[PDB]
Structure 1
Amino acid sequence: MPNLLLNPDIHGDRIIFVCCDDLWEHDLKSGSTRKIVSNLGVINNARFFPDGRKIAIRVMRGSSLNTADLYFYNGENGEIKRITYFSGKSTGRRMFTDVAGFDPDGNLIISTDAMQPFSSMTCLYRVENDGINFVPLNLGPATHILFADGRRVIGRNTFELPHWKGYRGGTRGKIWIEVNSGAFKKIVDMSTHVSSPVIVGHRIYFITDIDGFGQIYSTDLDGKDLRKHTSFTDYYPRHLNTDGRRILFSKGGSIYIFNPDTEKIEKIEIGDLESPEDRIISIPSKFAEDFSPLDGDLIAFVSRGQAFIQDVSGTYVLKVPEPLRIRYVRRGGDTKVAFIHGTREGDFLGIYDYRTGKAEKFEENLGNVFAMGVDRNGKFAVVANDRFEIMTVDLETGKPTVIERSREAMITDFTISDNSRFIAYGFPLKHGETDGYVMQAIHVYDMEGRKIFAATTENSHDYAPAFDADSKNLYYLSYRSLDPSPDRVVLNFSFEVVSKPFVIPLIPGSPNPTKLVPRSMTSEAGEYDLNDMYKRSSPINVDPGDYRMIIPLESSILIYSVPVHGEFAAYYQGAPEKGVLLKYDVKTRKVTEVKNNLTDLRLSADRKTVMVRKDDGKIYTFPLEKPEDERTVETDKRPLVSSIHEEFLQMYDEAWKLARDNYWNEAVAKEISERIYEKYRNLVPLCKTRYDLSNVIVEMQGEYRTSHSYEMGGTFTDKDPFRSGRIACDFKLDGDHYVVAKAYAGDYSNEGEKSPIFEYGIDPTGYLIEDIDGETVGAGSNIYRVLSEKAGTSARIRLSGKGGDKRDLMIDILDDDRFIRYRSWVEANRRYVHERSKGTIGYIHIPDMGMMGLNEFYRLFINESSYQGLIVDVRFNGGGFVSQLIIEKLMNKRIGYDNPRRGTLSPYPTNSVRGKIIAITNEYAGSDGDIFSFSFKKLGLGKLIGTRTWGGVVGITPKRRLIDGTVLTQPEFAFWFRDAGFGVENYGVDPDVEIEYAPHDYLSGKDPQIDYAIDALIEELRN
């Protein structure tokens, strides 16, 4: 088998390209191929310098390739060297911090957002002294920079978009060109996306699928005389590059050459290049999940598609004998365990006995299982799927039996009584078809009689059902104890601690046990009766809060509590929720803490064993009786063994299956899926690395020609992420000393919003940096590398200001300073707007529509809302889902005031904008960003200024990962606007008044968009 080649570059007869994440070179003449650089991490781009000697390379590091930096290769002495220490952030579709092009003097011009507030701001810089100094070209964000006849050609967002074929939104690739020896004119703005521009002679060649498929086109230096040069049909061509004579590119894993003069295309013959060891070793903990307690103090868990039965120590480990994809494992007997085996067709229930060895595997398809349990008596199992069904699968025959089906969400929260007669579960429901909220009611299914009874009413959210040992009461939780908690910043209230436990006696007349009603004073002995049991419901005297689990015991109740906390780290960083295990003594009614720092918990069948996960990420196990004796679960004793190609085929099929099963439009899926499957599956075997597989998967996702088809997570390299030392400053190499060109700061009194130097009572601006940690930096020592090497610690920095102002401070070298740059930028625009509007206009900026957007919006809204005018800047808004909450505030109309005997007026409502509002937006605002922009217009809150937005409004909520941890996303939630349908998708929102931000606008240092906004508002504030 051959390899998957990609992203080539040419220089005469020599052709460099990527294979197995490494850089190779091939000679057209001799026909020999060789690897010129490796073990640097994952290389995706290599660009030949003018002299064809050195090579600028982009390499990605960090498990998920979240970081990137640039290296120089010299084919003369085989020398390799790192040039940038920006640790540019990157993702699959935005592999920023790359080579932009080369100026006429042969200098490298890079494109990075490392020193910018927004990632999309990939500004152009000229590399000097191998990375010693960087000189900004101030031409604005750019992906490509080309030079023709002393004129500057600029490519905006001109990178490949494999994940979204047929893209026609506002962020589509466009090419501008210089004309007035200083002015720029847009020359290539087609309806579809334009990528990988190059110039041969006096024509610009590029790629686009304006006709339904990727082909190579070209035009003159005026964007005129459009010509189509290729007619591919197999795969989209990508990565155009040239040397001035011939164009080079890759397609379907092969490299091709295009001769502009001949207009003929040929495939270069390279053949087999590398085939590394297929059988690989992995660390079980890294991909582990579904940890569960078994009988005899044993442990079961799943990792990378495999399942194991081991002792806590991980010394005696048994691997379940079953092919790829074992989604779940559950205790089913003394030595038996039930499991869910997943295949391309679906999920199936299977049983295994780690004592005898027998392991039958049923054929009854259950759909996509997401929850699975087994009764204590080991006769049947309860299963939940993506069809919203809850069923009982016979552990003997294999025959499933659907109990009930929800039409809103999955029935994953259930439990079986110890006598295997009842099944309680949360049943999602809605009063109306177009209802805004989804309620949940506990249902109880009786194996005898086979009828469903209602445990609770359907007015809120009831969950975490649980039976007691004797099977005489059903305990559960619910968010019904309504009580508002005050917001400390904004006039607002929310339900923070409204969770309370309840119980329902299965025998009418029997009282709530926690009530401690004297037995002699009651007359139970009645018989089971589940009718109108929601009427006998009773609360358990435990203070409200936020409970996730309730475990009834003999004379106590265990409750899993989660203290109120911020959501920022969880929303972005993905940080786990911190909980604690509480104990309620039925007798003393006293509450205590049994264990803290928990992030997950599971209880055994016999209610005696506890398995938890703590914040340190480790799994522990302790007996419920003596929680003092916990042990650490070890699983990394025995290596994880697998085959790259079998996993790759497995992963592909799943990615492909999810894309089809989750696409918003079911109809289109059947056709799209079946049409692209085979084509892309044939490339899988050419994939030797994770990144290779990614290239294939992403291309097949783009086949849905829709937004939000992403790929995040997964392990691409064992290389540690690039590091970067930052102190929120801009350095300029002047002479033989680095000077502080700029010192960022937003709100000095806030946290993390200014160069750490400020804490010593001085503005570093203009100062000279002598040395850092005793080492001199300047014309010889790269300050960036140095800083990079101190990242995460405090280093001594010798500073020199005007006169004899000498400073010697222990500065904190930050790992990142993006937020500081951002806040500085906002506060800057804030000042600008205040000054220019003569103090009559306020300013606010919404970075996204998630937790950060909420923070930034209110951070200023509370101080800028009461000006004559307001500018709501949503440029670069990455989306989220709180736009509606923002519109709601801006929607408020001020209709009254409060007059105090002493003090100033108080507006009504409080959260009301005082005057006129204007919205600024660009092609970098999308998803909820698109939603917001469209809504602002529709509701006529004011005028929309800027440029057409991104154009992707099909929501995504992933719920399944790949065996390697990869998290794929599928456009599953189609946003429908009234009087526009889904029109916004693949188009964006048009601003009432369009205002471009040309390259010359950046050269002048003026923000035409914010300026128009100010001026426009001043005019509206004359009435």
Structure 2
Amino acid sequence: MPNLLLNPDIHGDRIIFVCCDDLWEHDLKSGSTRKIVSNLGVINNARFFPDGRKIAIRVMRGSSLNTADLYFYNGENGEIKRITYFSGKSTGRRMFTDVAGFDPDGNLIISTDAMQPFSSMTCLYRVENDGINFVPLNLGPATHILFADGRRVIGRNTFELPHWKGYRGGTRGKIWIEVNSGAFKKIVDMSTHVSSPVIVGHRIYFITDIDGFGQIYSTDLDGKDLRKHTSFTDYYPRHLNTDGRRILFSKGGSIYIFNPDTEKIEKIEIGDLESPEDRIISIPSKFAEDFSPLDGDLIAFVSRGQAFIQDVSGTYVLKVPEPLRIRYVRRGGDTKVAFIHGTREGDFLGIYDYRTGKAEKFEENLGNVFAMGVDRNGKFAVVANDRFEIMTVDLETGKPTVIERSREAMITDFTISDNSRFIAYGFPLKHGETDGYVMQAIHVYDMEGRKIFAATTENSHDYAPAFDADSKNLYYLSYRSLDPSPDRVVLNFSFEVVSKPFVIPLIPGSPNPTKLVPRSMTSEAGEYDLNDMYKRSSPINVDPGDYRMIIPLESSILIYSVPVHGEFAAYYQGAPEKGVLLKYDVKTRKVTEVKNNLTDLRLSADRKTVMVRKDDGKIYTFPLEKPEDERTVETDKRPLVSSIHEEFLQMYDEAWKLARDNYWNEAVAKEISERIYEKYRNLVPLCKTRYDLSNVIVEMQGEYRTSHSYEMGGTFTDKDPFRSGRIACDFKLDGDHYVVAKAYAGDYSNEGEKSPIFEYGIDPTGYLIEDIDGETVGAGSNIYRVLSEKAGTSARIRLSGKGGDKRDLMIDILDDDRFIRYRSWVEANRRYVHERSKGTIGYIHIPDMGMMGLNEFYRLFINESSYQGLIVDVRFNGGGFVSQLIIEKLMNKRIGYDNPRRGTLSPYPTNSVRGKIIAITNEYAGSDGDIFSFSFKKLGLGKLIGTRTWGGVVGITPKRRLIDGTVLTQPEFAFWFRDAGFGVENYGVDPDVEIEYAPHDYLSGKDPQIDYAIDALIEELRN
């Protein structure tokens, strides 16, 4: 049982590497292997210092490894020590805050976006006094820095890209070298991505797949004389590292050595190192899914692919006897439950009787199932799959029967009448193939006659169908009550409260039951007649709002309501959507609140019990008759038990099937998936930790050679994330004291855009920081670590000014200050533009195409769109989906003015840009950023300035997570431009004028890209 070895480094005969997230060292001379450091979190990079005495180490913490910092390991005394307290953000595809290289004097040079407004701005800093102080090199963003013959070699974006084989975009790794003490030239710029540069003698060795597979290459210090030294065909090589003589790298889980002298490649024999306990225990609540009420006050829930039946308190628990990946569980009878069991072949329906203990699985492959329900009488189930079909499956014969198939989207919103006769469901549809909007109408399936009837017209979005207990009326919701609500900042309007409930009596002539028409004044009788039932529809007298569920009861109607709210937290922090359960009394039309702070709600079969998940993340149950008697559902009394290797195998198969099933190009998907299956599946057995599995899965993902093949979330370590204390200030160690080199502030009047010290009436710039909470900081006291220990609280800080000014303040020590640094950066650019343009040009920055993007665009658009010219900066734009909404605003042409008796002219449109526009972009702008870039040119809004963009336009919409919570993304939506086709993918968008941002440009403190945009416009504005 061998391990997956990775990311090595070498020094003489000593080789260090990563195994089981820990650091190991192997002496080639003796052949002995020993673990030199563990239990620090997940280590992914280790680098010997020049003299090979000390070792710089990068480690990640946080369940998803989203934070990272650096440590030093002293092999002499076995001393471990943390060096950085930045808690740098990190993702598998961008594991920033790392070792960049070492300088002539042997000092460590780190790369980190810790104190920068953007994660792509990983600057170089020379560490001093083991972290006490960081001196910036000012060479701009870079991943590696080597020193050859007294001149610096800068590797930009040179980290590995296992998730994207064949990358050829604008963000590809390139190499630059100094030619004149402060003058740099780009020497290595190939069509493909260059990673892990190293220097042996006078040759730069690096890795690329320009020939169709990962191989080691090399060039002279001029980037000339390209040579290919390997011809690997099994697994891509990664992580080159050298001591100046021999080169070391990893490939397919094994460590290898490459001798530049002989060009010989030798595998190092290390053998079995560590095989931890396979049988693990996990907290069921941490991987909980599908909570549903059963009869007898019992509950069912799915966790980590296992399903359980238990009493509320979690004292009496029964695990459903079925192997891995039960996706859904639903009440099937008195003591029976129906469930969906997924395998590598697909999903299947099964039944389990927790009383007798009998379990039966049907062989019918239902495809990939995303919704499942069972009729109250337990005779059939209703299933929806990614084939866009809704079907019934006889719970006795297992025989399925497709009811209808949508060609637009899945039919996951359905309900079954209590008498099991009708099935109402939201049917997605479009009038034409290229419609921009998918409508949804409610269809009803009559089991008797097996015929489909339209309950609503196809003009809007109807949903949440629900039958009353007596199966006589069909209630549902629609977003049809159009009424616009005004935007409070921009001249705009949107539909915010247009949700309204409706009902359809199934028996013609029978009135809307909520209308209370006297029974003696209505001619009852009549048989079921589902024809033209949309013509009979009637709304219920409930104010429009934003409803998600309607539950008709004897004398009242429950309605799930979601208050109008901002999207920022959900979009970026996974914050849940908060709702409230409202009760509408039919008799008095009075509405009351039943429960608030909800995020989810399940209803009992008999409508007597309600299960809810609240914003606190806990599950509760309560009688719909007396919501006061609410009980908390407990699930962690009993531990979750599993086998690592069994789960690892199950996960790989699922990650592999998902990548195949959701790849945008079906044709290509079959070939690719079959070609890479075994190759990577074979490495799974070497995996012992979650990280190990990740290296394998990501490599197999990269085989699709398409953008957006990600790995997010999941649990990799039980280590709490690293902490960092910030006050939006930069520090410089001057002598024995720290001095506030810079204090950031964007718009002073906005919330969260300035050092918390400004609220005290002073600008801390040039002030000396004496001590924090009584602890002196400076020469022998790391201020970063101290802030780190105070993060999230207010500590007394003592400041000294140049004179007799001293301050004693209780300052809020933030956990982060990136947004502050960003808004400071933008506002700095804004002033600069106004200054250089002499008040004739305006400036707007767009950080991404999501909610942050909308915020910042308009935040400045309302003040900056009326200058003679306008600069739209989309550099570092992280993508999203609102580019089209911004373009729309930019496209507005000013064609008139309102002339008031008093006041000034009002331009028409109000949202029209007054003059000339120019846009700036770069290699860090991508996805929806690529689209904006391309669009800006295509629609002739103005010139595009900067460098080629990222080149990733194959979108994603993940809808399944692995049993451990991991969210993998598959490039499912390929964007196609008229005239350019799918050409943007894997290339990017070229600007009208390419303006490089060189290492010597950062050294001089000039932004040639913004300078050009400013000048180019001053020229255009002449006439």
The Cα offsets for residues 622-677 of structure 1, whole Å up to 9 and x where unpaired, read as 00000000000000000000000000000000000000000000000000000000
1:470 paired to 2:470: yes
The Cα offsets for residues 135-192 of structure 1, whole Å up to 9 and x where unpaired, read as 0000000000000000000000000000000000000000000001210000000000
The Cα offsets for residues 593-640 of structure 1, whole Å up to 9 and x where unpaired, read as 000000000001000000000000000000000000000000000000
Give how far 1:509 is off. 0.1
Q: Secondary structure at the match of 1:861?
A: helix
Distance 2:293 2:356 in 1: 20
Distance 1:951 1:907 in 2: 37
Q: Secondary structure at the match of 2:574?
A: coil
Distance 2:181 2:54 in 1: 31
Distance 2:787 2:244 in 1: 39
Which residue matches 2:870?
A: 870
Could you tell me the percent identity over the aligned residues? 100
Distance 2:58 2:961 in 1: 28
The Cα offsets for residues 440-459 of structure 1, whole Å up to 9 and x where unpaired, read as 00000000010000000000
Distance 2:85 2:422 in 1: 62
Distance 2:817 2:433 in 1: 47
Q: Secondary structure at the match of 2:765?
A: coil
The Cα offsets for residues 549-593 of structure 1, whole Å up to 9 and x where unpaired, read as 000000000000000000000001010000000000000100000
Give how far 1:739 is off. 0.2
Give how far 1:25 is off. 0.1
Distance 2:563 2:824 in 1: 33
Give how far 1:286 is off. 0.1
Q: Secondary structure at the match of 2:125?
A: strand
Which residue matches 1:452?
A: 452
Written as runs of structure 1 = structure 2, the 5 A alignment for 1:604-1003 is: 604-1003=604-1003
Distance 1:347 1:853 in 2: 39
Q: Secondary structure at the match of 2:180?
A: coil
Give how far 1:822 is off. 0.1
Distance 2:787 2:962 in 1: 37
Give how far 1:689 is off. 0.1
Give how far 1:240 is off. 0.3
The Cα offsets for residues 38-87 of structure 1, whole Å up to 9 and x where unpaired, read as 00000000000001000000000000000000000000000000000000
The Cα offsets for residues 269-319 of structure 1, whole Å up to 9 and x where unpaired, read as 000000000000000000001000000100000000000000000000000
The Cα offsets for residues 883-910 of structure 1, whole Å up to 9 and x where unpaired, read as 0000000000000000000000000000
Moved over 4 A (4+): none
Q: Secondary structure at the match of 1:1013?
A: helix
Which residue matches 1:10?
A: 10
Written as runs of structure 1 = structure 2, the 5 A alignment for 1:473-488 is: 473-488=473-488
The Cα offsets for residues 465-499 of structure 1, whole Å up to 9 and x where unpaired, read as 00000000000000000000000000000000000
Give how far 1:121 is off. 0.1
Distance 2:1012 2:569 in 1: 36
Give how far 1:508 is off. 0.1
Which residue matches 1:73?
A: 73
Q: Secondary structure at the match of 1:36?
A: strand
The Cα offsets for residues 760-781 of structure 1, whole Å up to 9 and x where unpaired, read as 0000000000000000001010
Give how far 1:365 is off. 0.4
Distance 1:182 1:588 in 2: 81
The Cα offsets for residues 713-754 of structure 1, whole Å up to 9 and x where unpaired, read as 000000000000000000000000000000000000000000
Distance 1:804 1:24 in 2: 54
Distance 1:801 1:516 in 2: 77
The Cα offsets for residues 885-944 of structure 1, whole Å up to 9 and x where unpaired, read as 000000000000000000000000000000000000000000000000000000010000
Which residue matches 1:267?
A: 267
Which residue matches 2:43?
A: 43
1:282 paired to 2:289: no
Distance 1:529 1:647 in 2: 51
Distance 1:393 1:925 in 2: 48
The Cα offsets for residues 76-132 of structure 1, whole Å up to 9 and x where unpaired, read as 000000000000000010000000000000000000000000000000000000000
Give how far 1:969 is off. 0.1
Q: Secondary structure at the match of 1:755?
A: coil
Distance 1:377 1:434 in 2: 42
The Cα offsets for residues 213-232 of structure 1, whole Å up to 9 and x where unpaired, read as 00000000000000000000
Distance 2:810 2:877 in 1: 36
Give how far 1:855 is off. 0.0
Give how far 1:21 is off. 0.1
Give how far 1:434 is off. 0.2
The Cα offsets for residues 350-399 of structure 1, whole Å up to 9 and x where unpaired, read as 00000001101000000000000000000000000000000000000001
The Cα offsets for residues 853-892 of structure 1, whole Å up to 9 and x where unpaired, read as 0000000000000000000000000000000000000000
Give how far 1:257 is off. 0.2
The Cα offsets for residues 319-369 of structure 1, whole Å up to 9 and x where unpaired, read as 000000000000000000000000000000000000001101000000000
Distance 1:500 1:524 in 2: 27
Distance 2:754 2:260 in 1: 52
Q: Secondary structure at the match of 2:139?
A: strand
Give how far 1:534 is off. 0.1
Distance 2:506 2:876 in 1: 57
Q: Secondary structure at the match of 1:658?
A: helix
Give how far 1:253 is off. 0.2
Distance 1:123 1:399 in 2: 62
Give how far 1:538 is off. 0.1
Q: Secondary structure at the match of 1:210?
A: coil
Distance 2:246 2:642 in 1: 43
Distance 1:789 1:828 in 2: 31
Q: How many residues align?
A: 1023
Distance 1:758 1:198 in 2: 46
Give how far 1:1015 is off. 0.3
Distance 2:905 2:771 in 1: 55
Which residue matches 1:296?
A: 296
The Cα offsets for residues 672-715 of structure 1, whole Å up to 9 and x where unpaired, read as 00000000000000000000000000000000000000000000
Distance 2:681 2:548 in 1: 42
Give how far 1:430 is off. 0.2
Distance 2:597 2:180 in 1: 64
Distance 1:301 1:267 in 2: 48
Written as runs of structure 1 = structure 2, the 5 A alignment for 1:89-100 is: 89-100=89-100
The Cα offsets for residues 516-553 of structure 1, whole Å up to 9 and x where unpaired, read as 00000001111100000000000000000000000000
Give how far 1:802 is off. 1.5
TM-score (norm 2): 1.00
Q: Secondary structure at the match of 1:934?
A: helix
Distance 1:173 1:776 in 2: 43
Distance 1:526 1:74 in 2: 88
Structure 1 residues without counterparts, runs of 5 or longer: none
Distance 1:801 1:905 in 2: 49
